[PDB]
């Protein structure tokens, strides 16, 4: 029962600032972004964000809110377990590293 | 349980075209490509996020085709996924999947 | 599966450091990917798929190799890995690593 998690969503790259900037605006401020290929092979974005499991529903439904276009290939989000987190600057673990 | 895991496999560039059409073929096209280094040499990761029953399958698919018999033929990893969602429809569970 | 995927994000300035630390450890399985965090700044990612045993020296290598004393060092994450296969050999488990 870490009650941390690994939040991996695959998104449009167009859809990438409104759903950085709306994710920002609610408070989520830790996430890496890659440049992937999806589903041909299209440029897709991979956004990673380390959260509290009580946060992960609101991210959730503001990366779903964001991302959607209603066509086909707007993307997945994962919810992967996460059972340790370590600061790296003062080698703190736990939440409190988030 | 869950029932869905996360199948992270870290491949040869060269073999990327084989082992994405050989998934394709058996109807797995759900994957997400990204580029990486490893050993520094270039490599590929794929993702793919299945449902459980379906692991064997695309392990061995992967395994069958990334392999050309030298050292560096990769790795395949299976990561647990407590949860999975369109983003075009919310759907949540092996429906989004 | 005592088995566990080391996920770390640092600095780019880091990366040499770190990976030649490891490796000094006996660590040389490792896959390094280009990323951006926060704004947008590239960072590095490395991931090591190791036995659970090990995490600890790791955390410790990545930790005290990566970190300058500002504030953006980066973190580490510990994510379960339930079963690891050898693309060449098909060889699974703790001795795939
Ligand atoms: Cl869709
Ligand atoms: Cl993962």
Known sequence: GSHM??????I????????????????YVGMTVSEVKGRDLLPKI???????????EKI????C?????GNQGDGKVF???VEEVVRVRT??????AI
């Open 79 to 81: 919810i992967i377990p």
């Open 91 to 96: 080698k703190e673990r736990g939440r409190g």
């Open 60 to 63: 959730i439904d503001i990366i």
């Open 12 to 27: 449009r790259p167009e859809r990438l600032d409104i759903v950085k900037n709306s994710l920002t605006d609610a408070g």
């Open 46 to 56: 991979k956004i990673e964000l380390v959260v509290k499991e009580e946060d992960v």
């Open 5 to 10: 998690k690994k939040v991996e969503a695959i």
């Open 65 to 69: 809110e964001n991302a959607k276009t």
